[PDB]
Structures are given as structure tokens and as C-alpha cells.
DNA sequence: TCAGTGGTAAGGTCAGGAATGAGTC
DNA sequence: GACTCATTCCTGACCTTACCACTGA
């Protein structure tokens, strides 16, 4: 990938530059403690030399550092560090870009040397470069070049001279003299460990051929900080870090060509510009009244130097570059000279605002480079750009005015204002000037609000005049006047930019919801934007219309939420009664490459500033694809809708923008009863989801309400889950003992308490695969993600009819139309239509029974009874065939039932509906398509299904060995705590056919040394179940099925060898996958070598388990290893040659196993000395980290690395 | 002002084949 | 001069859960 190099390099470059700046600041006596407090040292001046603690500098540097100290007090230390770091990074990147394109006058490279790695070409042409840059002191430099030493100082002087020369062209990025940042430039630039080496030889020089590279830098420099700050409340200083992305080029072209190009083409329909714009959309045919209305406002002529384009959040300047291209085409069409166009465009067409200085620097550099591509003599003229960063007003009020001395030069310096001094307009009045006071009062919190600040248009022209005077006082004034003007210019310039009215506003606004916005921004939004205070992009969308003149265009790409969510309903009304929709492309998710996830789902629109309710917009539906496919579809004008008036959006209550809905569906939807207040929201813990919720297998069943009797601490809860219909997702339990006293002590939100333990339906709030509802029996609670539906005391609708309706294709389509924003909130579900019928109830009952039968066939459900294979006593292959037939019968029955339901629904409405995503999917584990996903072809999961079935059989056998299950009775047998009551169960005869282990420790060895070896007991289980006569073929079938998918086949081995290899290699991972990182059989392993491994049943563990494990399993194993090692030593001397080679090579393995087992035995003795007791109520996650490194995969389960004694 | 219910998110995890790289033989 | 395993390397698919926000008494 082209962007991989920059993506890897940029954050590391940020870290390196920050470290260098911090070190340089510490050398200057400026530092911050752990808490962040300033630690400015005291400067001691002796022998015309300043000292800051231990370090010393010449006296000449004393004043400059003082300014840095001021910047350390008026702003934070971290702000100063970040600013200096990215300033130097941007300067170096700009120099590199200009040297790779030959834009430097001397024509030699600065940061590198062609065809010579780790060299600088500038040092080979010192006289020429010195004459070009430092004519007054070239000879001395030559002398330095003659010295042979002190090359670092020479290179530093040359680089600083290059920067000072570049100051004139780009005042926004380079300084000229008395620059504080020169003190922070790192030394040892020419060495092999400098910051320049990474920049030079970490990015290929072929990546600098286009301006686009700049944009990538703009995104990749700050990615780590974005990851650090995202997800919580964002401070004002961190606002840019969370909202800085790079917009794809085709989206920008679509936005620009349909706003500026459209304005040009309206006046000049027959112009050679439409052929140069690939993304220009032809308007649909309109009624004669609409055409007559439009023709009455179109001007008869447009002057090219009158089109004003503004980017309220310029960022890297991509939108400005595309606008520049379009305007250059327009100027060339009008017939201007080629080399004069760029200056005109940059001086009277392009305007840009940003809240971050880095973005302003990058945008200015990008615009200048794009102009330089066309004009050779540019960068030598005083081109003044109108792309700025907003500055917060904190300077003094009257001191700057006194320094300015306006009356001395022209007039209005003592009391002359826009009005008389004594008028005292509004509250700001005129302490020095009416206009100046009013302007400065508006930017007291600029670094938080940005471009949302409103400036009256009536003050525009006056401001302009004032600005002009400043432009003359910075060139034709004394020192005080020059510095006062240089201080005042940015505020007046930003005010004038905000006070102007524009033909088009094109932007990609920041996205930030209610959680991320801080208090000041939130209260400002509440006061100023009542209809769009819930998000930042909505505020930008509403504020952009106030910056437009009449008949202007607003073109933006933002979140799709405002199209559908209720929080923006009022906003939509305000849009449908005052504005005109021109065009829209709905992009959905997977747009904006280099961004992952489905939170960001976007739409790009162009809207006019006038009102016409009978206009027909053009819509494109580009939701379901990736970025390249979306671009190709947009280029081919695919998925177009042009048959809906703008007023027609107001027929549906709430006025959603549902452009792709059909008229018949709308008519059916309007005249149909809704679900109503039957749907309610579930409970929610305050911040303790991991304290009160468990998975069912990891607690005792005596305290489980669904299984136990009397006392109940744990209750089943519906929490959502993946797509599943009519039954399932019964996997979570909550602590609700004594009516949730512990929950009430935690200030939990127990919503709708009176509906608990009732039967009803439940759906998943957060989903991206479609809508589904499942039956919920009595004795259940429901979470906020598992919101529920309940029937009234006596209503005409039963719960089964509602379930039948909600799982049909009609409701699926309607839910897709109503809730396309990743959430199915209760208020949106409350308006789903419901249909009353009689057959639907029995059809839903049959579907629920089938789904329950499908769900209860695995160990993961607490209603599991027994393994399905062992019910047939004929043969293992015969049992597998019967199992497959049973699953097929279930699948066919459910298919028929759903088909009948859909037919009944369709014959009532009177029309057929289009199939939607997973509209006909059957959500059963008996269906391989649902279980293993969709492949390119069918009949490709037979081997995987067979392997999974055999693995489940082996897991059931292990569970029978542990005593969890039995062959004499169905369901769970022993799931209590601390091995209490197991002796009574064993004495009663619950394991008569297949006895259980006497202590709950199963050695997972690689030999038949132990009598309770797992492989031998699996063989015994197979013999007991399917008889003795056909044992060998059953074992062969099991081994072949395991080798099909679970493990790789081996050249030569028997069935038992394959079983042992699977048990020692794959069983643990399968168990962890099945129980989802909450195991009930814990694996104790010695290490990378299988010296000793065992399985312990969690429910049979007690404080005497480790001692028994050490005594009965580890010490005899050590004795056996010692005896075996002693045996091999005797045979080595007797044998010789190649005969003894195998003995020698196996003795080393035996020695390694013995040493590892001794270390593990020492650790086990230490941990067994402390009698460790665990409470199952604490959960597997907490209890799994109490044994150090004795357990396997501690980090994957607990989440943190195991500790060492 | 506090109860009692609803709303929303420039994201976060995870299975699952392709590289990548140290032991064997 | 290949084999054989144990780590990354994305890559596409899928659902949070905490903390606001909005009425009634
Ligand atoms: C995603 S960038 C878009 C830049 C440009 N469209 C591009 O693709 O390069 C959004 C920018 O808006 C800026 N921004 C955030 N909040 C702002 C505010 N309140 N006022 C003005 N600009 C703001 C951020 O600094 C950020 O750089
Ligand atoms: Mg045992």
C-alpha cells in the first residue's frame, strides 16, 4: 500500500520531535513536574553568560527565552511542546517537498544527496548556496568548509538561512529573525541518529510527487493521540486531535462540482465546462412553474472575480484545491492569461478557517504548491492568503491602542471610533474604538467555538477598511506601530472573513456527539442552537446557511443521523420549509477508507438557500459496497431516484428522508395500527456490568433460580446477542438477591420493575444484520440491550401474533426503512405496524417449538439433556447419519412455516415486497449457512460439520468423566461448590454405568502411566456406548473425522494416537472457544514442554486440591522420570555407533522434561502451602488470576499478564 | 429539584486465512 | 535444501454499555 510508509512513520516522528523539544526545553531551565506544574529556573548572568542551573548559554539568547517563558505561562507546557514539535516537523516536510520538486533557487538538495545515502549535497556546493542565501557572510562559511571540522555548525547555519529565505514566500510557516523556535532546534543534525534520518530514508521519494502526500501526513501525525483521547469527554485542547481526517477525493469533487460548477452552468448552460466535470449531476425535469420561478432569480452574467468560496474547517485544504481547479477552468474559459490566473484565484476567490494552527500551515503550503505548479514566478510576489486559524482574544484593551497611535498617522487615535466616543453602543461601548471593542468581545473563547461565532454582516465593509490601514502600518510605521499592527492583524482578518457572505460553503465538519462535548460547548450550543445542539455536525450544518448570500449553495458530507433520528426531527422541519434539496448521495458505511467500524456512516448533499416545495431532487443509494465500488457506481449514475417531490417527505410523521420507499408501502404503513407503548426499555447497572453479570455455567446451580429451588441469588437475563429468531440467546445471569438490594445500593437504573418475571418478547437494540424478536418465558429479567415487549391485561393481540408479525419480511423491510442507524431504540420500535390474524398464532407456536428444540441440543444451554449421537445403539456412522437427518427435518419444517407466514401476510396487504438482507435466512444451528456463514458455493462444510460433531462428542465424554454428566440420568448431575455432596451422589449410584473420577483431576499425559488417563477412558466410553464388537471401526471413524478438520492428518499413526494428539493439542482451544473464555475445566500445564498437564473441574475444586495434585501426580512422575533417565545412562556405555545416537538424543529431552517438572513442582509446592479457597460468585475472570503461572493462557482469560513470585 | 423512563455514539473485538521467522533432518 | 511448528498481519463481520436527555410531581 502507498500509505503504509507514512502511516508507520508519522506518529513515531511526532514522538521523536516531542522528545527532542522536551530535552531542549529542559536544557533551557523550563520543565514540568509529574503533576504538570511549572518549574521555571532562575537565570544567573555572570561573565556575559547566562546559566540556568547546570547549563550555560551566551547572554544574547537571554531575551528570546523570556518569550518562551511567557508562552509557558499564558498557555500550558504541553501546548508549547506540541506547537514547537509540529512546527518544526511541518517546516522540514515542506523543505523536503520543495527540494524533491526543484522549487529552490540554488537547485541543490538540502536534506539529502542524490545517488549517495546519508549525505547532504548542499555541503558540496558551499560557495554557491552561501551566495544564494547568506551573501554578507559567505567567505567565513567557506573558511569553515576549509577547516574540515565543524561541519555541524555550517549545516545548521545553512538550514537556518534557507528557512529565513523561505520566510518571505510563506509568512504563515517560516519566520525571519529573532525566532524563539531556533533555540529548540535539535543538535547533531548531520549525525546518523538525528530526526532527519527517519524523514529522509523512511519514506520513498516517489511518494512526494503529488500534493496528496501532505493530506496523509495531516492525518497520520496525530493518530496515536486520537486513540488516546477518543471515547470520553474531550477537552478544548484535544478537540482537533479527535476530528482530523482526510476526505476522499471523489467525494470532494462531487461536493465542489455541484455547487460552484452548478452556479456557473445555470447562467451559461452552453459552456465547455460540463464536459470537464465528471461528477456534475443533471437536474431532473421540473414543472413549468418551478422552471419559471428558477428563471426569475438567475443572473444574466457572472464576473469571475466575484465568486466567494469558504471552507469553515479547511484542515489540509483538499476542498480548496478542488475549488481552485474548478475556478481555474472557469477563468480559462472566460479568456484570461494563463500565468495571471493563480494570483487572482488566491487573492479574491478562496477563503478558509480552522481552529488548529497545524491545519492552517498545511493548508497554506498545499495551496501555494498547487499554485506553483502553474505559475513559475510565484513565491516571489507578496501573495496574501485568506486561510487562517482562529485566535482567542486575551490581549490588553487600551495599551495596544495607545501603541498603535492611529491619530498620528492618519486619524482616529485618541477618541475617534466608528461612531462618536460617547455613544457607548450596546455593552462593549468604545474604550478605544467601537468596532475594535465589539470585534474583540466576540472572540474571548475562540479556541472552543471556532467558526460557530456569529459576526454581523453590517460591520463587514468597515472592518475591511480598518484591515487595510493595518496592512499599511506594518510596513510604514515605527517599531511600536509595527508591533501593534502585527498583533492586531489576525483578529481583524478573522472577523472580516466571518463577516463576509459567500456563494458556496463546502466543508467536512467535525463529528462529536453529546458525550464528547464539554460543558462550555454544550451550554453555548443550548443557548445558540436549540434545534441542533445534540451534535457538532448539525450545528455546522445549520450555521452554514447564515454565512450564505441569497441563492447560495451549502454542500457538505456528514453523518446520516439527521436524516432519520428523532432528535433532529425539528431540524428536518426547518429544512423542509425554508430550503431546497438539490442533490444527495447516501454513502452509508465502509466509505472513508483508512477508517474502520460502522459508527461512521455518512451522506453527501448539496442544498440551495431558497425555498421551492415542488422541486424534484436527485438521490443516489450507494450504501452496500466498499469505497471503490461506491465511486464506480456514482460515476455510472447507478441507483437513482428522481420521482419524489420535496413536500412528499412530510406525509410520514417525523418527516424522515426516506427517498427509496415505494408508494404502496407508504399507503399501507399509514393506515395500520402500531405496536404502541407495549415496548419498554430494560434495566442497567450504573458502571458495574462485570460485577453483577455472569455466564450461567460458572456458578453453582443451587443458587440458580432456573434450576434450583427455594433460595435464589442468580436470575436469567435477556441481554441481546446476535441474529436469532423465536428463541435462544439464553446465556447471561444477573445477581438479584433480596429484590436487588446490592443493585439498589449501587444506584442502578431499574427501569420498568413491575414488568419483571413476565412472559413476552425481546429484541436486540444494537445490530447491523436486521431485526429479530424472540420469545421470553416467565422468570426472566431484561437488560437495556435486550428491551422487551409485553401485552396488556386484555387486548386483541396475543404475544404469539406479535412474534409472528415481527419476524416477517414486511416488518424487516419497514425496520430497515425506519432504523438504518445501527440502533433499534424503543421509541422507534413503538411505531412498527402490527397485523391481527388467527393462523399466525399457531404458526408462531410451531416455530418457537422448533427453535427451542434446535437450541436445547448443545451443552451451552441449561436445558441440555444428552448427546444426540449416543441415542442410537447401532453404529457411529449410522448415528451421525440419523443426526444429520434430524437436523434436515428441523430445517425443512421451519422453512415451510416461515413461507406460510409470509404468504398469509402478503395476501392481506395486497402486494409483494422486495427481499432484504437476510430476509429469508433461517437462524438455526441445523442450517450450515447460518452456522458457518456464506461461502462461494454450497456443500462445502460437510467435513467441518463432521469434525465439530465428533469434537462435541469427545467434550461430552470428558464431561461424563468429570461427573458433570452421566449415562444413567439426564441433565446436569453435579454442579455444586467445593466438591460438597459428591460422595452422596456417588453412593446413590448416579454413575453406575460409567464411573466418575474420585477427585476431579484428569491427567492429560502422553502415555498410559495413569489409570485415569483421558484417552483410555474415552476408549472405555466408546466401548460402553456402542459395544465391544465394533470398537475398532468406531475408533477409526472418530480418528478420521477428527483429522478431517480439527487437526492435520499424519502419515502413519493409529486411532488412539490421533485421539491423544487431539486431546493434547486441540481440546483446550476448543473448550475455550465453546465456553467463550470462561472455562469450567481448568488446565494446569508445566510449560512449553508437555512434562505435566491436567484438567481440574471448577465445581469440584477445594483448598486441598493442589496438595493432592502434587502428592498423587507430580512426585511419582518425577520418580518415574528419574528412573527412566537412570536406565538410559547404563545402556549408553554398552552401545556404540549409530545405535546409541537415538538414546543420546532422547536423554536430552528427558533431562529437559525433568528440569521443567522440578521447577513446576517448586512453584506448585509454594502455591499449595497457602490454602487457596475461591468463591464461584466472584467469577472465572477474577478467580483465574489467583494461581500465578500454574494455569495456561492467563492473559487471554483474565486480561493481564500473570505475575511471578 | 428529584424520580422515572428513553437515546445515542469519527469504536472495539474477534475468527481466520496469509506472511515471517527460528528449530529439525 | 527443504520441512515444521509458533508468532504476527491484516481483514472483513458483528455488536456494546455508560452516561446524558426529556418530561411529570
Ligand atoms: C476532518 S477535518 C476536514 C478537513 C478537510 N475537509 C480535509 O479533508 O482535509 C475537520 C477539521 O475541522 C476542524 N475543527 C474542529 N472543530 C472546529 C470548530 N469548532 N471550528 C472550526 N474548525 C473546527 C478540525 O481542526 C479538523 O481539522
Ligand atoms: Mg483423578
Residue numbers in the entry: 1 to 1205
Q: What's written in the study?
A:
Anti-phage systems of the BREX (BacteRiophage EXclusion) superfamily rely on site-specific epigenetic DNA methylation to discriminate between the host and invading DNA. We demonstrate that in Type I BREX systems, defense and methylation require BREX site DNA binding by the BrxX (PglX) methyltransferase employing S-adenosyl methionine as a cofactor. We show that BrxX contains MTD and TRD homologous to those of Type IIL R-M enzymes, and, in addition, contains NTD, CTD, and insertion loop in the MTD specific to BrxX proteins. We show that BrxX alone does not methylate DNA, and BREX activity requires an assembly of a supramolecular BrxBCXZ immune complex.
A 2.2 Å cryogenic electron microscopy (cryoEM) structure of a BrxX-DNA complex shows that both target recognition and methyltransferase domains (MTDs) are involved in sequence-specific recognition of BREX sites. However, when BrxX was incubated with a 43 bp dsDNA fragment containing two BREX sites in a head-to-tail (H2T) arrangement (DNA H2T) in the presence of SAM, a DNA-bound complex accounted for the majority of 2D class averages. Single-particle analysis of 11,152 movie dataset demonstrated the formation of a 1:1 complex (BrxX:DNA) that was highly homogenous despite the presence of two BREX sites. Only the first (from the 5′-end) binding site was occupied, suggesting that a stretch of DNA downstream of a BREX site is essential for BrxX binding. The DNA-bound BrxX is a bi-lobed Pacman-like monomer consisting of four domains. The DNA bound to BrxX is bent by ~33°, with the most prominent distortion occurring around the six-base pair recognition sequence embedded between the MTD and TRD. The fifth adenine of the GGTAAG sequence is rotated out of the DNA backbone together with its deoxyribose moiety and the neighboring phosphodiester groups and is nestled in the active site of the MTD. The TRD contributes to the recognition of the first four base pairs of the recognition sequence. Our analysis identified a critical loop (residues 587–601) in E. coli BrxX MTD that confers specificity to the recognition of the final base pair of the BREX site.
